[PDB]
Coordinates of C-alpha atoms in Angstrom, one line a residue:
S1 CA -16.6 83.1 -164.8
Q2 CA -12.5 83.3 -165.6
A3 CA -12.3 87.0 -164.2
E4 CA -13.6 85.6 -161.1
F5 CA -11.7 83.1 -160.8
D6 CA -8.3 85.1 -161.3
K7 CA -9.7 87.6 -159.3
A8 CA -9.8 85.0 -156.5
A9 CA -6.9 83.6 -157.2
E10 CA -4.7 86.8 -156.6
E11 CA -6.6 87.8 -153.5
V12 CA -6.4 84.1 -151.8
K13 CA -2.4 85.0 -152.2
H14 CA -2.7 88.4 -149.5
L15 CA -4.7 85.7 -146.2
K16 CA -3.3 86.7 -143.2
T17 CA -2.3 83.7 -141.9
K18 CA -1.7 79.5 -142.7
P19 CA -4.8 78.2 -143.4
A20 CA -6.2 74.5 -142.2
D21 CA -4.6 71.4 -144.3
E22 CA -7.5 70.8 -145.8
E23 CA -8.6 74.1 -147.1
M24 CA -5.0 74.1 -149.0
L25 CA -5.9 71.5 -150.4
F26 CA -9.2 72.3 -151.4
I27 CA -7.8 75.3 -152.7
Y28 CA -4.8 73.5 -154.6
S29 CA -7.3 70.4 -156.0
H30 CA -10.0 73.3 -157.4
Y31 CA -6.7 75.6 -158.7
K32 CA -5.5 73.0 -161.0
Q33 CA -9.3 71.7 -162.1
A34 CA -9.9 74.5 -163.2
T35 CA -6.9 75.5 -165.2
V36 CA -5.9 72.1 -166.6
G37 CA -8.7 69.8 -166.2
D38 CA -8.4 66.4 -165.3
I39 CA -5.0 65.1 -163.6
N40 CA -2.6 64.5 -166.1
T41 CA 0.7 63.8 -164.2
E42 CA 2.7 60.9 -162.7
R43 CA 2.1 61.0 -158.8
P44 CA 5.0 62.1 -157.3
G45 CA 6.7 59.3 -155.3
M46 CA 8.9 58.5 -152.2
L47 CA 9.0 60.5 -149.8
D48 CA 7.5 63.2 -151.1
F49 CA 4.2 63.1 -149.1
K50 CA 3.5 67.0 -149.2
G51 CA 3.7 66.6 -153.1
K52 CA 1.4 63.3 -153.0
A53 CA -1.2 64.4 -150.9
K54 CA -1.7 67.6 -153.3
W55 CA -1.7 65.2 -156.7
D56 CA -4.1 63.0 -154.4
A57 CA -6.3 66.0 -154.2
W58 CA -6.3 66.9 -157.6
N59 CA -7.0 63.3 -158.9
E60 CA -10.3 63.0 -156.5
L61 CA -11.9 66.1 -158.7
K62 CA -11.2 63.7 -162.0
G63 CA -14.6 64.3 -164.0
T64 CA -15.0 67.6 -162.5
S65 CA -15.8 70.9 -165.1
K66 CA -13.7 73.5 -164.9
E67 CA -16.7 75.6 -164.8
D68 CA -17.5 74.1 -161.5
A69 CA -14.2 74.1 -160.5
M70 CA -14.0 77.8 -160.5
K71 CA -17.1 78.2 -158.9
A72 CA -16.1 76.0 -155.8
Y73 CA -12.4 77.5 -155.6
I74 CA -14.6 81.0 -155.6
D75 CA -16.5 79.9 -152.9
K76 CA -13.7 78.8 -151.1
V77 CA -11.5 81.4 -151.1
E78 CA -14.4 84.1 -150.0
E79 CA -15.0 81.8 -146.7
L80 CA -11.3 81.6 -146.2
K81 CA -11.2 85.7 -146.8
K82 CA -13.9 86.0 -143.9
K83 CA -12.2 83.2 -141.8
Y84 CA -9.1 84.6 -141.9
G85 CA -8.8 88.1 -143.5
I86 CA -7.2 89.4 -146.5

């Protein structure tokens, strides 16, 4: 399934337009969950709200298996490809 994941990770780089914030966070959180696994970093501080939003989204997936993370990521990329086009 890693092959399909790596392909989706490449195609998502070609979306024709900027997706919604929640779609972006879904892609980010599942990408990290699928590559690193459970969140293992310190939450950003100060005024880095962009970083805080991403950290929190990944944190919410704690406990999700890499296999499930990859599947959800791939399905989301397919969803975005159709919605915004590649």
